[PDB]
Amino acid sequence: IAKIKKFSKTRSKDIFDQLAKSLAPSIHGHDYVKKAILCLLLGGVERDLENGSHIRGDINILLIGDPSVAKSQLLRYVLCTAPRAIPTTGRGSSGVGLTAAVTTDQETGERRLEAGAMVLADRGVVCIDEFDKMSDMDRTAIHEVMEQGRVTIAKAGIHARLNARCSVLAAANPVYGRYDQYKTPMENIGLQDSLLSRFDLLFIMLDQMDPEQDREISDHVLRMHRYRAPGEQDGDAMTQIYEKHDNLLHGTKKKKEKMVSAAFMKKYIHVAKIIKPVLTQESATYIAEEYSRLRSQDSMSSDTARTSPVTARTLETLIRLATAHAKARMSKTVDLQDAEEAVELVQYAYFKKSESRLKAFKVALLDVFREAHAQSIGMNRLTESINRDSEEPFSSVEIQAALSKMQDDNQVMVSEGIIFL
Amino acid sequence: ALVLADQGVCCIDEFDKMAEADRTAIHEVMEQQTILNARCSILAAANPAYGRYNPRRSLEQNIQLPAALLSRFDLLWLIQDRPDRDNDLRLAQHITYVHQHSRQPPSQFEPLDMKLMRRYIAMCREKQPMVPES
């Protein structure tokens, strides 16, 4: 407890930076994926209302990319670290396996309920590899859990509702086998809009074979391969906050930084999950403005396309990611950078690759001149109509400057207070 | 399901995502409220075939349902997600207030309780007005 408090007080803002960094030493890169996994481990806040309506507090993340980008490795690591983690492959378990069923007991003649895969994993993690190979119908079955975290069962003589408040990791391959750079993400993913919208985060991983990236990946893989556990004879067949430095696992260059131990990380994650943050008013307006900007970005998308549609659930995802990031560091309130981190994550995940004076003046002049239907217009009506339909009565000096510029353009002539085209 | 909701309301969604074989049996229930008796009020939900309603295409093509089936529905209501900036901002702020305050935004009058509305509907169903000839 004392060590946790000391680490929280000393490392104030670095916690969320360090835990994502020290999440998986055996996996190189994918900082955003590590941050998302950390947010999943921290989790959101479930809110129950006076009316009894339930609002989901879980996050769903889908990873799509080329083969051999260490996605199954991340899934296995999450399975090992998470307390209640259940792996369910695509065709390994059907809807009957995932959803609790009803069996008629022959001994007594009554009907009993047998829990499914997701029912047992309450407040846990469910990992689904090869999510593309899963049929659409199991997707519809999982939709209810992903929406409200509950399963309703009704077979003649019995009816019940079971809690399924859980988080889901999903790993899927593109329809063509390898992601197409030229084709749009919609064709490559090949999934319905509802399923993508129900997912909170979408990550696209590309096996970019850059010279330095290939060299670094090869060096990391070779260093991990050549590593051998201490205390063991060579050739044999077969708690401090910061991990002890190793020449092979870390390297000479990485001597300036240290990684957090697994046990201390688990204890800190549990303590953080215990913590219940409270949202602040200052961040609410900023989040709302950024959400409005995101929704209006359709006219500012440039050549970039969107991986997932933006709906009302994106605001919920932003709030939940902010809550998780506030849970990352032991605190009580939500700050600006707390929302900024979630906004940056959404920007990264969602998108993949005076003069107004003159225009208003010209529009007003058009309206004035063909509301008169004549080539001469009185000055009083001119000024009244120009400054009436416009929210701003424009400055006289700048109006005269524009008039002089247009006179140099031989478009408008003003004589004795009367304007002629 | 239709029999279970006798003298009640059968709310069915994803109507456009069902085979025509069941649709054929739905016509008799709509026309005569019988199957056994099926005296129920049908409330159906539907989505466009392509995921977005296209005003260029005809209504039947956008609904991929027969004209007779739509005619047997006494009321048809289309809702389109038309993008309006002010309306979008108002919807967003209302959603924020519902999320944060656990409650609806404060309207002019507080809505009645569910039990009170149920009793009021039960009492109003008891009366059988007679149509005047005027």
Whats the size of chain A, residue-wise?
421
Contacts (Cβ under 8 Å, ≥6 apart) of A61: A36, A40, A169, A170, A199, A200, A201, A202, A203
Q: How far is A241 from chain B (nearest CA, A)?
A: 37
Q: Which parts of A88-149 are beta strand (E)? A: 101-104, 111-114, 125-128
**Do A292 and B92 lie within an 8 Å CB cutoff?**
yes
Distances (CA, A) of A59 to A275, A412, B11: 18, 62, 30
Angle between helices A262-274 and A2-10 (to 10 degrees): 80
CA distance B71 to A182: 47
The strand pairing partners of A413, in sequence order, are A420
- The residues, any chain, with a CB within 8 Å of residue A29's CB and separated by 6 or more, are A217
Contacts of B100 in chain A (CB under 8 A): 279, 284
* Strand ranges for A307-365 from DSSP E: 351-352
Q: What 3-state class would DSSP assign to B74?
A: coil
Q: Which residues contact A349 (CB under 8 A, 6 or more apart)?
A: A32, A201, A202, A203, A307
List residues in chain B that are followed by a break over 2.5 Å (C to N): 35
The answer to whether B96 faces chain A, any CB pair under 8 Å, is yes
At A64, which helix (H) or strand (E)?
strand A60-65
How is residue B73 written in tokens? 């529905």
Cα B75 from chain centroid (whole Å): 9
Provide the experimental method for this PDB entry.
Answer: cryo-EM
Identify which of A50, A51, A295 has the shortest CB distance to residue B88.
A295
Q: Which residues of A touch B (CB under 8 A)?
A: 47, 49-51, 55, 193, 279, 284, 288, 291-292, 295-296, 312, 315-316, 319
d(CA A272, CA A38): 11
Question: Residue B85 in contact with residue B71, Cβ under 8 Å?
Answer: no
Q: Which of A190, A155, A156 lies closest to A173, judged by CA?
A: A190
Note whether B92 contacts A193, CB cutoff 8 Å. Answer: no
Which of B89, B95, B102 comes nearest A315 by C-beta?
Answer: B95
Q: Which helix (H) or strand (E) holds A87?
A: strand A85-87
Q: Cβ of B88 under 8 Å from any chain A Cβ?
A: yes
Resolution in units of Å: 3.8
* Spatial CA neighbour of A26 closest among A245, A249, A227: A249
Q: Residues A301, A351: contact at Cβ < 8 Å? A: yes
B87 touching A (Cβ < 8 Å): no
Pick from B95, B99, B103: which is nearest to A50 by CB?
B103
- Closest to A30 in 3D by CA, of A75, A79, A60: A75
Other CB atoms within a 10 A radius of the CB of residue A29 amount to: 14
Element (H, E) at B12: strand B8-12
- What's the CA gap between A168 and A145, in Å, rounded? 10
The secondary structure element, H or E, covering residue A347 is: helix A336-350
Strands A60-65 and A167-172: parallel
Taking the C-alpha atoms of residue A246 and residue B48, their distance in angstroms, rounded to an integer, is: 60
Type of residue found at A206: L
On chain B, the residues whose CB falls within 8 A of the CB of A295 are 88, 92
Buried b or exposed e, range B73-106, using 16+ CB within 10 angstroms: eeeeeeeeeeeeeeeeeeebeeebeebeeeeeee
For helices A262-274 and A312-328, the axis angle rounded to 10 degrees is 120
Please tell me the distance from the alpha carbon of residue A186 to that of residue A307, in angstroms, as a whole number: 7
Rounded to 10 degrees, the C-alpha dihedral B107/B113/B118/B119 comes to -120
Spatial contact of A319 and A334, defined as CB atoms under 8 Å apart: no
* C-alpha A299, offset from chain centre: 21
Give the integer Cα–Cα distance in Å for A6 and A101.
49
Is A47 within 8 Å of B102 when comparing Cβ atoms?
Answer: yes
